[PDB]
Ligand binder design. Sequence first.
Ligand SMILES: O=C(O)[C@H]1OC(=O)[C@H](O)[C@@H](O)[C@@H]1O
Ligand SMILES: O=C(O)[C@H]1OC(=O)[C@H](O)[C@@H](O)[C@@H]1O
Ligand SMILES: O=C(O)[C@H]1OC(=O)[C@H](O)[C@@H](O)[C@@H]1O
Ligand SMILES: [Cl-]
Ligand SMILES: [Cl-]
Ligand SMILES: [Cl-]
Lengths: 579, 579, 579
Amino acid sequence: APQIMNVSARQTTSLDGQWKTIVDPFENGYYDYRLKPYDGGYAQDKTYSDKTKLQEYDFETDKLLFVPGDWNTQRPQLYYYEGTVWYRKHFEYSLQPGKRLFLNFGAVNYEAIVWLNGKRLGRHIGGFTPFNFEITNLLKEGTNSLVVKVDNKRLPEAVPTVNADWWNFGGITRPVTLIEMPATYIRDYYVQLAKDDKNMIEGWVQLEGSDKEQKITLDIPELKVKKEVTTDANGYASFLIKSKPILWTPENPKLYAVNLASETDKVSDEIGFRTIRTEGIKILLNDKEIFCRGISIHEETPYYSGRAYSKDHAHTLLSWAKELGCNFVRLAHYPHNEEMVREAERMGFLVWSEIPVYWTIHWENKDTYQNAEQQLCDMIARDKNRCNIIIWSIANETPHSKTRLTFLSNLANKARSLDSVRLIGAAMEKEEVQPGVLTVNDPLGELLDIISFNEYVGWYDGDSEKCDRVNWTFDTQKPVFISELGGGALYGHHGSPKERFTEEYQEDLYIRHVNMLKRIPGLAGTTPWILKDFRSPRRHVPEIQDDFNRKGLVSDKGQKKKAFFVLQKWYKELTEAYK
Amino acid sequence: APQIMNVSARQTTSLDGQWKTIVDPFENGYYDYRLKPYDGGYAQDKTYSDKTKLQEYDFETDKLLFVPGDWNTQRPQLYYYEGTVWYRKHFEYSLQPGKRLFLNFGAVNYEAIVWLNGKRLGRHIGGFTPFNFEITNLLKEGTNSLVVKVDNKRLPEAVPTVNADWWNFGGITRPVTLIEMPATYIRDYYVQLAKDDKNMIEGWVQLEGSDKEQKITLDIPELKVKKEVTTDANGYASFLIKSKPILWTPENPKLYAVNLASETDKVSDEIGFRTIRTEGIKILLNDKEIFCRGISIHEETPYYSGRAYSKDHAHTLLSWAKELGCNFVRLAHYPHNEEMVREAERMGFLVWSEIPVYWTIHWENKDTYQNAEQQLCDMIARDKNRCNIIIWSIANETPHSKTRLTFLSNLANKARSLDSVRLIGAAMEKEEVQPGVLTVNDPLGELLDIISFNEYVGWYDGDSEKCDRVNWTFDTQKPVFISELGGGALYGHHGSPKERFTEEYQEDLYIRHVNMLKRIPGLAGTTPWILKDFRSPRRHVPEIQDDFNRKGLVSDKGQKKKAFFVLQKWYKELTEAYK
Amino acid sequence: APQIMNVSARQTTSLDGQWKTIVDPFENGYYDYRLKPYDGGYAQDKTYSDKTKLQEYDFETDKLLFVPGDWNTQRPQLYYYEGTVWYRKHFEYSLQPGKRLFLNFGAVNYEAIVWLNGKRLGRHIGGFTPFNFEITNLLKEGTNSLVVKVDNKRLPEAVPTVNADWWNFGGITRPVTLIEMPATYIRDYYVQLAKDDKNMIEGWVQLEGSDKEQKITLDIPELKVKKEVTTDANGYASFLIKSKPILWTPENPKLYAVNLASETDKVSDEIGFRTIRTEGIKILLNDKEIFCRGISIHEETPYYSGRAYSKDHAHTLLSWAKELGCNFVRLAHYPHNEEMVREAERMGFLVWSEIPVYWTIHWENKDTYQNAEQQLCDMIARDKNRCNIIIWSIANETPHSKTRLTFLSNLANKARSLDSVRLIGAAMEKEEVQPGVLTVNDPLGELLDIISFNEYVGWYDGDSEKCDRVNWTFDTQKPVFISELGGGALYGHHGSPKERFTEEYQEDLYIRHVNMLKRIPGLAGTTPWILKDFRSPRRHVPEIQDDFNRKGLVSDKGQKKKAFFVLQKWYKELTEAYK
Ligand SMILES: O=C(O)[C@H]1OC(=O)[C@H](O)[C@@H](O)[C@@H]1O
Ligand SMILES: O=C(O)[C@H]1OC(=O)[C@H](O)[C@@H](O)[C@@H]1O
Ligand SMILES: O=C(O)[C@H]1OC(=O)[C@H](O)[C@@H](O)[C@@H]1O
Ligand SMILES: [Cl-]
Ligand SMILES: [Cl-]
Ligand SMILES: [Cl-]
């Protein structure tokens, strides 16, 4: 049940493919007509072979869905579907006596309940974080039955809550993986530069199993590092290593082969090293002032606009951001699949990583907070060794209230207790305190390392001309980071620059908006909204939006709109200026 | 806002056809990103003509839906859809000064919010009862804008609640009608035999408007009845008329032309006269002992299985019940459209009329009770002059608890206060107190005129053989009425009589079940479940159920299964026996 | 092999329900990659149990379609589908040796190839006529396999050809029925009044089998008719019977029970008696001058607009025609299912019955002619005992050419050789010889008993005003019969009477058109186009047509448009005038 670090480097076997499925809007497979749990629900996966008896379902003859994937793009009937879909997989696995076996879900939105061979393994909430179950002693010989009850109903108390500006993609949205482990295994580990220290690698390792006291070697061959330690009675060891690694940058995204070997287990990784801090209004990477030439990205695929999960999806999306001139991507509004973060790391993109504490979260609900903090912990735990991540984001466009501030302050404190190195951010919002004077007056700012916020001057707030007659002031010397900006346009839809949703309007907006950006004191980064048009049930203009947010600089079909080249040109200028 | 009696006989103009629609799962047209109501939502029906400004919707270029109808069968994407769909209609109407105009909805499931020309008229809950709004002084010249926000999300506190065995058909499911009235009009009236009195017609009439004190004439030309009264200061008058009408029966469903004429209004109706009472275990129609040779029917169409609304739909369904040998139909589990009740009345079918107080209603919720009692009142108010209705049903398969009993007792008392003539029923459930001994031990029975209940011996409770080894006893001498019984089968699916869901199993079940029925003391009626296969999201056997309850004696494609003729044969015997 | 009269009255077993199907556009199940027919294709119906061998199909685990029905309305993917769909059904049947068994198809559009237990039974072309195969010797014990390859590709040489104004509904569109016969059975018979004779019933009976020479008795008990004859060695016998039947009329559609008994077979029927002839410009029914107050009707269902096949469908459609005031229905453009003709027979509608010799048939193709003549023969053979049919129509809107005239003259001669009683028609077209003067100048008229033609003054030919100013003349004294007229409208779409496709334009058109009809010399009948909106792939106005011909006086959803009441009022007047 605890998280497993670096699943892809383990002895893995995929369960992906096409699974049997039952769409169950009234949850008949779980509740009887008295609304009570009952024995003989769909978790038993009883093939309906003996028709002298009555049952009301049969996985064996029902329809398939692809796993991994959202269900919404797989059948017209499931486009809007919010509720329960049952998934069922049969598999065999020969597990040598003494070896251990874990079932890992990359993500399931939103609620997953999991059974193996009719026995409940457990339950998960949160649609974008991984979870696993040990099945070592539950695996049978011959056919095993895996049943997953997936529900994506929107809940007021959930994280996210009943309103958000993206599609409610339900299903087993990321790979399902069997992981074989030795009886005592390296479960988790951390290897990164010490805070603000180009010359000191620090880290720790955590074993799980009955043989917790072991010698461990941390091996970084290219650095001629070979450090041996011994774990304590809890299976834990730490280390400090003086070294001079070549530091990762967007221009040279250097990664090192890192090998961990205990007496009973071994795992290899690719890990880069960098320092990150603010100094006044400056963002310093490896002690050098940088500008975050960024773009925002949802976890949604080119062309068919389903939930992204593969290296293919990531490489295409990031290849567009590369052509745009970016050294930075904001992955909104939740943890993305690990392939996306890894491809950003290898290709040279700094990353903003976020949890979906989005809009009107139930700040007074203690279960809601525990959910948000669990997603925070899981986000950091999975990716703590990804040096390209420099900002953890704890919220996006949340309304001001005392309970909200308390909620978010506790998340910010928790984040810092988990990771003293990376910057803490959150998408705040702007105000126009007096005509023409724009600022960010949000008490949340005091808990953040950057003045990060969304603003839509020239789209939601005025026509494009308004960019020309506003200026920005901030009452603190922290780097200013505009985490969203921009406007909508349909690729191939042309007209006057005054006509909204034409490419020409969006282009004119970006020209005047960039001019405004150039006047902002302390500006250190921009991640305009957004790289690719994406699905949203709040975008209803027929033939223009058609259930897509159209603020992409690239269409959902991979076409660069006119405004793409306005931002590209400015990012080219910023690249030269920050050399 | 008060109900209008006999809408079809008024000066009516249809608004049916195809309306503009916006599917809005996150209710963006109603709530902003702070989850607050906002000015400029979709109720304003602003055509998106000026694209120099931003808006996120446009009825004028969006997709159509048919009105009336469920949305589920109209688009694959809407099959399972639970949530909000906006409907918009433009119309003109020339209303002579001084005349009044009402907007009548036959039904909208589940919640309707209605605007005219951007102004909210009001809101309705309950998916099967009519409601109207006066628009006399809101109608403009030229184009008028009617916007209806329809939501069919299942609510725990709603009536019905989050679980039921039929499809959640959302939409404007019955005709939308403009009704023109004189300035003071006959709004409501009642004309029926006095309780247990073949020779006394009683009734009342209710005017609405400023000229409430008027002479009124009740005219029944075939009976040579011409009774003149005067209304009181509240617009109310009553009457008692000694007369010898030919009494309505299933064999001779006699209706009389009834004309009401006040000084300012007039309306004609077709009304029949009959007495109905129990005497011990006997049901007496016009003092004659009858058997209710019935069949249950959902409000769902032949062939395409959408929500039924027209005389065409009713005539086809009732023509099947006629061929089956029925003199009675149970219209489950909610008030059906008025065309169905009228066609039953004209063709000669006694009727059981029901409200959807079904399964796990929230008995302790005072809003829930007020909803249930309002639906009860509206059900009786619409159809109080339909002499073929002899049973009002207040519940179906509700679990035993003190709060439930209090809830249902209040409904039963309310029903009797509204209608002293018709019988009060409810589908109770059976118990097997000792092996082979079946009875109905439910305290609700004390408040009902009949021992009405569902039982599924040979389908849910045992195989068909169990019918042969059980018997029934009842501790009170009230007529026994089995409101559901039977089993499932796919038309065209054949095999051994031991194989469930074959026609042969269903046939064998009905043979043994009818033999069991013939042994029941006090049996006075049966409405087996069901006439036609119907949609249910709780029926998941692939290729057999496919989201249909298969307990029809007729398939959803109009095909008579083998079991149809078993019940037909018994009903033929009962017809002879009760001559 | 030959047609069987009155299938419904035989010992029938339905094979309807849901069948396994395979969509096969490239006909992989029939042709190999050299485009050669191969054996081992899909007609073998080999369940794919042994996966150590290679096979490219499996009926056993493939998708279902309803039989009977078009495929087009059953799946979105099959909406436009033109090509091959394979259908498969398993059944058991116990046949006592000596008894015979036939497989009857009410209709399959367009080409059907049929196999039983892997052996080809034969082939049929023509989408609207029934066909039979004897399977007496091919029936096996246990599971029998019936496979039908159905193809509705449009062919230039087909009847109809590659262009027509209705949907290409493919599939097994009418019931599939097993018919058990004695070894020598009554295959066909004819019982009708002799030409122009109110007192002489003439007829013949045709036996089939090895004992064709038998005593036959024809009983009409209500008429006290008992006639015994003996068939010849060819199985044939004729009879002449003096009687005085009550003559069938639309107002009193009298039918008699007719019983035929041979030594080894017997069959009952319901048959009515009437005379029909022209007299100058008069049509006389039972010697009485009548007007054919008609409406045209396609074989398409109310509400969901699939292919009609059942008594339910027929009754709904014809109940609309009854309310419209019709005594006559034109069933276009092909033979309708037998339920429609029988319901028109019992409800009191005279019938025009037609074969799809429509538009640009290949007049020079000898196979095309034999196909048309076979459909003619089959149409008349099936319904020759339906006294409500008074017109056989051999064509609709065919271009004038010498070869077309020869083709149609041969059909007309064949029709007359098969039926000396009923009238011969065909939908001709009009022309404007001189400005403002319309007539029918088609040499086909010489071969018809009526001057029957389609005209669209006010819709295709001018605006509605043109109806007010044109005059008509005809150079022969045969009854004039307008077989189509009218215009399109969307129900619920209102505007100026000058705006085409509004109900008001259509209403204004019918008012002016009806007045035009009153001055057409010789007019004896009208069947306006059309009763119900119907599917056509030539009707592309979005939101108005949406792939429907909108010329219905009733919408596809059963709603009477304004123009319905214009024609109803004229038919009310004609009913009084012709009393
Ligand atoms: O409105 C928009 O387009 C975007 O604006 C925002 O500030 C939201 O954070 C983002 O999720 C929306 O998609
Ligand atoms: O289970 C069934 O088929 C039926 O049984 C019942 O008792 C319910 O009242 C009915 O709504 C269900 O459809
Ligand atoms: O154009 C029309 O609406 C109709 O006109 C005709 O003359 C055709 O015979 C008919 O099949 C078409 O549907
Ligand atoms: Cl947008
Ligand atoms: Cl069922
Ligand atoms: Cl049209």
